[PDB]
Amino acid sequence: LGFSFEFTEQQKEFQATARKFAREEIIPVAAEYDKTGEYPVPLIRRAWELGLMNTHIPENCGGLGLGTFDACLISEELAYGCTGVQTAIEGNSLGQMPIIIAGNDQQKKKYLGRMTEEPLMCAYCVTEPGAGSDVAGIKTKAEKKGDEYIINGQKMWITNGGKANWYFLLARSDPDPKAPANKAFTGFIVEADTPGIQIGRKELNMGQRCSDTRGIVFEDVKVPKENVLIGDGAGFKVAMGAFDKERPVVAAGAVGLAQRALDEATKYALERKTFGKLLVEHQAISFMLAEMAMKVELARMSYQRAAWEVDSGRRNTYYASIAKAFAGDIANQLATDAVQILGGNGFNTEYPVEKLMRDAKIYQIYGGTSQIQRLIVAREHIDKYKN
Amino acid sequence: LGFSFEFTEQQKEFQATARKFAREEIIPVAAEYDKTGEYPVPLIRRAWELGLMNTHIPENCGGLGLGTFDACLISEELAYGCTGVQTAIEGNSLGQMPIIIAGNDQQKKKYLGRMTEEPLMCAYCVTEPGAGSDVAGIKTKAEKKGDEYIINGQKMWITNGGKANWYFLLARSDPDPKAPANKAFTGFIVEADTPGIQIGRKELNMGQRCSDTRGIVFEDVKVPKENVLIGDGAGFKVAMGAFDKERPVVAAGAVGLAQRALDEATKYALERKTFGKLLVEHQAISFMLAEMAMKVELARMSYQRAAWEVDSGRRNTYYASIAKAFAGDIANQLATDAVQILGGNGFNTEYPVEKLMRDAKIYQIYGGTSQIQRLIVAREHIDKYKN
Amino acid sequence: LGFSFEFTEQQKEFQATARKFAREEIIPVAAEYDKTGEYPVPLIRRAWELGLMNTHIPENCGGLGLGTFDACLISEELAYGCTGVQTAIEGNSLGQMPIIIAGNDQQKKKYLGRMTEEPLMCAYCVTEPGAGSDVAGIKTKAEKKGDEYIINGQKMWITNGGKANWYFLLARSDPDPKAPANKAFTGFIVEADTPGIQIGRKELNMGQRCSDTRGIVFEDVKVPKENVLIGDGAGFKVAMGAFDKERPVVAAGAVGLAQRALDEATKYALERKTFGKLLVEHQAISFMLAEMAMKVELARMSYQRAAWEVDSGRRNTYYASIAKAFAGDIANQLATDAVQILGGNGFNTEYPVEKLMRDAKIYQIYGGTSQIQRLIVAREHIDKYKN
Amino acid sequence: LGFSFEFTEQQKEFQATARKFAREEIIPVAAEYDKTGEYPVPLIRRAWELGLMNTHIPENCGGLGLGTFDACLISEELAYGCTGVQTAIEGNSLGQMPIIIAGNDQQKKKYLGRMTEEPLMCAYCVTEPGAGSDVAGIKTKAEKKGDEYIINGQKMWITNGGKANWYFLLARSDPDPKAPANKAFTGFIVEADTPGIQIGRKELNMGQRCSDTRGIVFEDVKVPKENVLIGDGAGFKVAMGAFDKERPVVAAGAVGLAQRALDEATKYALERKTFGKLLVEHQAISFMLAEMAMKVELARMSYQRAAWEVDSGRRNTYYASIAKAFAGDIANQLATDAVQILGGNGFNTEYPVEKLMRDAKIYQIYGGTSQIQRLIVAREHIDKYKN
Ligand SMILES: CCCCCCCC(=O)SCCNC(=O)CCNC(=O)[C@H](O)C(C)(C)COP(=O)(O)OP(=O)(O)OC[C@H]1O[C@@H](n2cnc3c(N)ncnc32)[C@H](O)[C@@H]1OP(=O)(O)O
Ligand SMILES: CCCCCCCC(=O)SCCNC(=O)CCNC(=O)[C@H](O)C(C)(C)COP(=O)(O)OP(=O)(O)OC[C@H]1O[C@@H](n2cnc3c(N)ncnc32)[C@H](O)[C@@H]1OP(=O)(O)O
Ligand SMILES: CCCCCCCC(=O)SCCNC(=O)CCNC(=O)[C@H](O)C(C)(C)COP(=O)(O)OP(=O)(O)OC[C@H]1O[C@@H](n2cnc3c(N)ncnc32)[C@H](O)[C@@H]1OP(=O)(O)O
Ligand SMILES: CCCCCCCC(=O)SCCNC(=O)CCNC(=O)[C@H](O)C(C)(C)COP(=O)(O)OP(=O)(O)OC[C@H]1O[C@@H](n2cnc3c(N)ncnc32)[C@H](O)[C@@H]1OP(=O)(O)O
Ligand SMILES: Cc1cc2nc3c(=O)[nH]c(=O)nc-3n(C[C@H](O)[C@H](O)[C@H](O)COP(=O)(O)OP(=O)(O)OC[C@H]3O[C@@H](n4cnc5c(N)ncnc54)[C@H](O)[C@@H]3O)c2cc1C
Ligand SMILES: Cc1cc2nc3c(=O)[nH]c(=O)nc-3n(C[C@H](O)[C@H](O)[C@H](O)COP(=O)(O)OP(=O)(O)OC[C@H]3O[C@@H](n4cnc5c(N)ncnc54)[C@H](O)[C@@H]3O)c2cc1C
Ligand SMILES: Cc1cc2nc3c(=O)[nH]c(=O)nc-3n(C[C@H](O)[C@H](O)[C@H](O)COP(=O)(O)OP(=O)(O)OC[C@H]3O[C@@H](n4cnc5c(N)ncnc54)[C@H](O)[C@@H]3O)c2cc1C
């Protein structure tokens, strides 16, 4: 009772670990990995050791059993170093989410347990080239055959896609088009090393070059019915819950990038003199940093509220979509203003800012696009007044 | 311990009392009071007996001894009903702030305890015809003369100016112009019943038309030495403090005016159907309302932080400024969007929304413009990076 | 044959005329008319003799035969003085347009001509209680008694509809709701004197109070057969044609208000001083003015474009709505920005700005709200790629 | 004359040619040049022979002798295909603009003519490591050696510094710090290979990758007094005049990128289906497209006017800075939204929109950043007031 914006000593220490790891271990090689686009294997092994990686995996699976407010708290620190790296680590949590909320005891121990005693990666396969935002459209067929299922399809833009040990899979189990979204799909947990899973090439994208984003083909994949999460048909709902829980940490990724641009821009404004006055002395510039500070702040508090809402055990769809919407948006506003203050240098590859601009954009695309976030928020807002 | 976004039981009770009051007692009559420009004496008196008024006066002074966080939540409600009345009531606490934060026990029993016994009002006198944002530019002087300070000068735009029992007055006490702000000004406690004071006529502003705004000339007003707050020079430092601890409460009322606009708009949106579809079914409007909720949802969190901060004995300046800047601005975007989705009806005096737009305006002018707020945030921010 | 951003010697003349009247005879009284709300009859009587008022009526019908471009530059200057009066004098051109563009020679001389004889008013009756934007949602009836129509209905937000000799009416003729817009509506030139025409009371609005606005219940108003403009059920286009034709003027009307806002605020900026600096010194303010300039410039060039399109015979719809949208939008931004720069004064009635803020609000709703503008621009734009 | 937006047959001609060349030779390779960064010699040469490259060289000297308008008309076309190409093709005009204004006929014959007979290039050197926007801040020392001038210092970000036949240069001739900008600098022409010029490495930037951007060093270069443009003292005013004529052209190209982003997103919105309907059916995607068209049509007019003003003999400064600022601004807004409509796809390199976003950022930095562009508008604006 009574509002409180105070972290608990443990949370404070996690923050200390992540922050140091980002500043002294990530930022130097962030640009190296940006250019080469090479997978951050060294970094993820470290992140794993420092215990900043499968932070949700329950304690009884050898995990830290940390909450969501904690994940966001960390992700914002890792993001300040490099979103391309943070996304990679975050992939595991997004993929582990379905098994964490909805898996049974035997499933939790078999798949979350491995991730704890071995730095393995996993991916969350839902998006199809045919449709990403409208989840209820996916065509990946899952034909029930005996005591197993035959998956059939193709996925697109999957994080850690070609580096996962196993995947979360959402497929259409009910062959009837008329079937309602709430009982038409099924969520499975399919091991990567399965005959029939053709993994596609790495896509070259504009902003998180070191992440493993790939398309993936499932032609006649067999999946044991034991590897069916809740039941046949409760896939959609399981997927929904996963997003609801994970969107705050994604917002936290935005504020991370936002912070970095706020820091970069300021340090420079404080060093560069232009019409004899320092850059920071020109009201225009000072006002920019003011608003850049105003935005990153509000974004910090939005994800916090969202995570706290979930951990308090309240459906957070409303506050999560608000958080993602705003943070991903402003993360893109701050990034550009940074390269703007840095002038001609900001457009150049040697300065950090340019990369921050390229990275920013996906925060308005993956994890639900900004338009979908609005759509959800209006869906939640009106339902309060409706009747 | 950790983060919390939960009000206490006492806060919930207060919030309720406040809400039911604005909802049922203010909202109705506010329409008439706005048109007649008549002071809302009745609504004020009921507020005073309900205890929604001098919620800062110390418990050992007949007061409640509530914090800035408490005043805030109450104010968002009163405002929701009507900002003209809220501002009329909030002015009281602003005037009493310098005494609360810097008056000795005797000045407190006297001027504070007095407001416990009868629904008296008071005002904060600082702004002048040619000096508002630039505090250290006031010219109203107060030269010592034995055991009195004889004060000459006029003040402008003083809220509750013509309906107050006593005043907080900030005047220059150092002749030498070069004398620094942190020792040149002195805050005196003037009784309205004092001879020398010339009270101007009620100014007609477009906004919170039932609130009492007017100018006050001070010809040869003597002030018994004992009414100085800390002493000569303490003025700037004491006014500055009040401003800080009090800004979050005004931003509260901006979010209040915002929440109202949002409500009215969503209710009307679920009413008017245009191309066979209700307004809530047209995506332009849908995204509009979602965005609308967002700006409110965030502004509320900004003042809450600013309030929590100061209550915890922390320097709130930075946040008090961020809150006020963001709250005031968004209220203006929500006012006009509310008028916008009510279309033609919104422009008509029979509909509440047009009033909301006229009112929202002062929120970027008084209590520190959006402009000076940007300046403060910038100053507060850059200092973090100066070495 | 090559671009030309220059007026004809002929046009420059009108500009200077309407400029004088606005900034000489209109401006001073506009202030009082707003506080009192009474119809600016004198000013209309003055504009009429001075020319500038029924500048569309064909030469052969008594009028100057001028055209929308001229109409724009003339009204832009007028609106500078008071949109209230502008909307009053424009109510005529709106009402005349459909009688012009689609009226048989007989009705042309019959109706438009008397306007040449005396300063008479006319209204444009489209909107009604349940619908405005949804034009095809008109429920106003009109039955044919062979050689005489019988109109039953009720219009609502009619400008100049309380001082009109006659009104253009658009009524649903085919009870069958499957009736395609293009064919389901008929346009009548009805006279106020006709029985059954029961005029509503004046509406109090937030802004152009000076202008007369009201509803009209058409009890059993019968209208002689020869009053149909084109032909029973071709009325839907005439209104749209009048629109397109006339939207540049309301835009220009907006631009006039935007200019008044910019003229007013800049003057203040070069007089007011805050930290021992004229307001203009502060880079934040100068950048603000530079943007208010940019907006007026583009809206000016945007309406000058639409006005030209239709004057070159080319259909303007696309460029017109682009203009109405943009101009309207920036009008408000400029009004609220001008207020801001005047500080307390801005929010005060002894000052011009406040009025301008309350006036600019209608420019986003009436004569095609900002939304439907974006709606038709997307329509026109898309079809250029559509097949 | 009289307002006209209709083209000349010849410009309609240039337009068609630039349209064919651009969309039929540039766009199908532009990407490959973005991946390799190879200076597009095949493109430059073909542009040289199509007669859409050194358009401003007068007839007598060999060139087409075209004005600023036709320049923009051709530049805005090429930009649609690729800004990187366009920029190199444009660097030439920038490098020779001063001479055209400012050069005695002897200089013209020898320096613009040497161009008109072979596909040669030329650079415009002004930006330095420590000065870019503050042009009066350049510290390169040009000393008067009795019969010639010696050059000492270094320039930076010189568009096409490694590929220029000759360079225009702006150096500080008056050592006396007190020396006002109006008489401090002088402009020279320098054959690329005068001894002492150490051209640096090609800079790697985020967006006009193929455009040959570098920094040069002028350790001890001899330059004959007959290569001085006007004469000792006149430099700043010459560099300015060049900028003033070129800025509309920089504005035009930004619009080109915008139109390329608009056409690209409009085509995908008409082929991507999401909730059982193509993106165009969603009001959010439809309204986005309208707002993108609006910024384009306007941005187009802003330069079309600014180019006219200058071609009409009257200073275009105020209009150039407006066109440039608004153009560079909306060019960036469209690029991003262009990405947004494509969703995940847009963020991938197999698509155009992504490269468009990387190219747009520079349009708010080179040729006069967005904020200095504002400064100028405010300068000229308040000027026509305070007199
Ligand atoms: C963190 C790691 C680093 C980052 C890794 C990369 C992350 C990624 O990109 S993954 C992103 C993948 N794709 C997306 O996120 C796109 C987002 N898509 C959506 O949000 C949905 O498609 C959305 C909201 C449009 C819904 O589709 P739609 O079919 O219209 O919804 P609806 O009919 O309401 O849903 C179906 C049923 O589930 C329920 N449901 C929907 N949303 C929710 C919710 N939030 N909570 C609970 N139940 C829900 C519905 O209420 C309904 O149940 P019923 O009607 O029986 O009560
Ligand atoms: C709706 C609620 C009911 C009431 C409705 C009506 C409310 C109102 O409208 S009354 C408000 C009228 N006026 C304002 O709000 C004033 C806005 N102006 C300001 O905040 C200030 O003038 C400001 C900070 C922007 C500019 O300060 P400036 O004039 O440069 O003085 P500055 O140089 O900061 O003075 C510095 C000194 O004061 C003190 N000081 C300065 N800022 C602060 C601060 N934020 N916190 C504490 N002390 C401070 C220190 O001693 C400091 O340093 P030093 O000792 O070195 O002098
Ligand atoms: C300052 C003082 C002066 C101002 C005073 C105030 C004056 C006003 O307020 S003016 C009235 C304001 N109201 C409006 O502007 C209402 C706007 N709404 C509309 O225009 C319509 O509802 C609209 C066009 C958006 C959508 O119309 P909808 O009902 O969907 O019909 P739509 O499909 O567009 O058109 C149907 C047919 O009519 C034709 N039509 C409609 N609009 C047009 C047009 N602009 N040009 C040509 N033909 C048109 C269509 O081509 C189609 O023709 P066909 O049948 O041959 O194919
Ligand atoms: C086309 C190919 C693609 C693009 C390739 C890349 C192109 C580039 O980036 S080139 C580099 C671009 N750099 C710029 O745009 C920066 C421009 N800004 C400036 O130079 C300054 O900041 C400026 C002019 C705005 C203001 O300050 P400052 O530098 O002190 O000069 P200022 O005081 O305004 O004026 C000095 C003198 O010049 C005169 N002057 C100013 N503007 C002009 C003008 N537009 N025309 C002529 N004379 C002028 C002034 O009147 C004054 O003269 P006087 O002796 O009568 O006082
Ligand atoms: C690098 C990268 C990594 C990703 N990683 C993952 C991952 O780990 N797992 C995963 O499952 N997915 C992942 N994705 C895919 C991502 O989830 C989708 O991009 C996103 O949900 C959008 O779907 P889409 O790409 O199909 O866009 P589209 O669905 O084509 O949408 C296109 C545009 O239309 C708008 N829009 C769509 N529907 C509507 C509507 N009805 N109303 C209004 N506007 C609408 C969208 O907002 C957008 O502006 C990733 C994508 C990228 C690029
Ligand atoms: C691809 C490319 C090509 C170029 N080609 C050329 C070329 O051919 N020739 C040439 O001469 N130059 C060229 N330049 C350089 C260009 O002119 C500069 O980078 C640009 O003017 C920004 O200058 P800067 O980097 O020195 O900005 P800085 O002066 O370092 O500081 C700039 C930042 O602070 C802002 N700022 C500065 N002063 C103020 C103020 N008083 N008020 C408000 N905001 C202010 C700027 O707007 C921006 O936000 C090019 C640059 C690039 C990247
Ligand atoms: C209805 C109402 C009620 C009020 N109630 C009270 C009350 O109870 N007590 C009291 O003492 N006062 C009160 N005031 C006055 C109010 O506090 C001031 O109006 C406010 O502080 C702004 O000051 P100003 O009007 O002098 O604007 P100015 O200081 O004149 O400034 C004018 C413009 O310049 C901008 N500006 C100034 N300096 C800068 C800069 N450095 N950079 C950028 N922009 C700048 C300002 O924001 C504004 O836009 C009230 C005013 C009103 C209208």
Ligand SMILES: Cc1cc2nc3c(=O)[nH]c(=O)nc-3n(C[C@H](O)[C@H](O)[C@H](O)COP(=O)(O)OP(=O)(O)OC[C@H]3O[C@@H](n4cnc5c(N)ncnc54)[C@H](O)[C@@H]3O)c2cc1C
């Ligand atoms: C002073 C005044 C004078 C006027 N004079 C005239 C006159 O002479 N003649 C005349 O015919 N009318 C006149 N009007 C009315 C004016 O034309 C209407 O207000 C306008 O058409 C908007 O219609 P509405 O108010 O009925 O809004 P509605 O049709 O109720 O629309 C309400 C809200 O929803 C939005 N909306 C509606 N449909 C959609 C959609 N499909 N997609 C997205 N958003 C949508 C609208 O933008 C608005 O925000 C006047 C109004 C005023 C206040």
